[PDB]
Amino acid sequence: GSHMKMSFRWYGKKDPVTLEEIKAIPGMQGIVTAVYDVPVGQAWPLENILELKKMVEEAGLEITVIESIPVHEDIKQGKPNRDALIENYKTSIRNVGAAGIPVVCYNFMPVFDWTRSDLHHPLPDGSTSLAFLKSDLAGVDPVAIIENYRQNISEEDLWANLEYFIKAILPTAEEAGVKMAIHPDDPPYGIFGLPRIITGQEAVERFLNLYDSEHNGITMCVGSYASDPKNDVLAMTEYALKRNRINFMHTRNVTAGAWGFQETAHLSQAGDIDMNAVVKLLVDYDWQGSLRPDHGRRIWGDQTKTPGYGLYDRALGATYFNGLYEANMRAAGKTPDFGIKAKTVGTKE
Amino acid sequence: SHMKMSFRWYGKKDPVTLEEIKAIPGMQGIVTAVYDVPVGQAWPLENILELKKMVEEAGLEITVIESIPVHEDIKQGKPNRDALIENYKTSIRNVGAAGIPVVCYNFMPVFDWTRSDLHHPLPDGSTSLAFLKSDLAGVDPSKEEMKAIIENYRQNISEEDLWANLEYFIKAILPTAEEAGVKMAIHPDDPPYGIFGLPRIITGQEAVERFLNLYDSEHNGITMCVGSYASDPKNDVLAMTEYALKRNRINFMHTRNVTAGAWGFQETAHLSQAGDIDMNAVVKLLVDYDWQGSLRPDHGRRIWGDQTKTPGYGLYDRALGATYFNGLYEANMRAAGKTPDFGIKAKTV
């Protein structure tokens, strides 16, 4: 039966936003984080991981998702030395299972993790936000790897590069008891001459099939998939739930059509995603995992640099999912839990 | 069946600005008062228009007026009351004379509310307002004038007197309010039971009916503050809310959360499982009855190093309140078949 742990992203010691503050978000249970002192491709030690955990748990919370044991471009590129990098991935996996963290979250997106044309695009209310202006700048080389991809490696070269990968790590993932969750490409389509393959329903279906197991699931990031209208998140989310292969939810809204795309407040009505439908769906399928609001607007004096990762609107995101998850739970004769063990401290009757 | 999510604003001197109040997803209405005519004297249109103007330019409207204060002398049924009830008559005239459809007021001797502690700690390390009975047991509440206003109430005004003093006031001002199109909504007493041997009468289901009945008319309404009434365990807010809804008698909604006991009470996060009120059931009611007027999340906790010193009127947890209600509303409207709505014209500029 259902079990959704409201979660927040936290970059660790050097985060603008603190655990004190994250904890104050009504219903917050999971911290979604990573090790940041180990170079990409290089293998996370247990101590790095337990350091983060000790901090997070003292704050009165738990790490429920490692967001991103990063994939070395060499691996993505399909270069001969991959196995070396892959064996390191296997260690990091083994190490996270060792810390008791249920899920690992990763992308297979070549040289770029995300693309945004404007980082302060105005919205109909004064708040800024990020957008992808299909017009602006677009159609210019970003000023060796890129040319490699552009020239040689096809999408199906990437499909085989990727299957090699997940075929290498999955048994390790299984023994650690860690659920992999592949993060869609963002935007979910070819740019810059680079290829993207994790982009829609057909790909989620081919990907899961790469290695048929729950240890091999997706991170349903509705705002990424829906950054291309060619995509319908609802049937995608459902297909994926019907199949038991969502291991992580992100839940940011986005407005889109043929013109490009722009991130908006989480509220279904502010963008093109019916967020109620999304969580109603998480409800009826007794989904068990974690959800993060993910990405916000710049509202108020918001001084967090690091892009959509300011506290305020992301917090205003979780409490909206609080209302959505709770109302839908009740509607179905289901009793919602938010992990509150005490209303008060020291008073009581 | 359209509920206009609103938010209280204190005029030009508020550290919370409308730029900020505007940025909360779905926020439409503002809730405000005039703060320069001393109390029982008349409210000049010059003073109200210039607040609407300040509001209407920021994208928001004035949806409801949080308090033209009834003067003590009116409440005490003193002889000089008619002069004061006069000014109050016009106050009602000027407000209708400026589009704003709801005036909210109270009938609570001596105090507008009483707490014992404005930084009581909660389990998540944040602080919130509490009223601890056992901590106000010791206390004995102009400064030398209040003394004998209390004495007057204590000794010479019984509940039934105060009921009669309210009766007068009501049939005095109620025609005026039907003549200006303004709807009166009375706040529950907070706490909803006597303290310091001072009477309170707007305290529960009984009071509601009797009050409603002084003037069986849709302009004679309550502000249904679930939190105020839920501060007494003896009360069933879900029943009281429904009761008042069948009579078309809700002219405003406050949706603050408390946890109560024989011990007193404390304000909590708006979220249900954090307090004692099932907000979902509340808004479900509001929905199931096609209610119309504005809802105001109330009293937020004190989180994220907020410094604003007014009661529970920082921006943050009040804002986290509102978008929790967005989610609770939306999810309920769809669970019915109705379609929700927020301030929302353009997704993008």
From Swiss-Prot, chain B:
Keywords of this entry: Iron, Lyase, Manganese
Cofactor(s) recorded in Swiss-Prot or TrEMBL: Fe(2+); Mn(2+)
Enzyme class at the top of the EC tree: lyase
Source superkingdom: Bacteria
Enzyme nomenclature, EC number: 4.2.1.8
Pathway: Carbohydrate metabolism; pentose and glucuronate interconversion
Catalytic activity from the UniProt record: D-mannonate = 2-dehydro-3-deoxy-D-gluconate + H2O
Gene Ontology molecular function: any one: mannonate dehydratase activity
One example of a Gene Ontology biological process annotation: D-glucuronate catabolic process
Record HAMAP family: UxuA
Protein function: Catalyzes the dehydration of D-mannonate.
Family as reported in the entry's similarity comment: Belongs to the mannonate dehydratase family.
Descriptive protein name: Mannonate dehydratase
Gene name of the record: uxuA
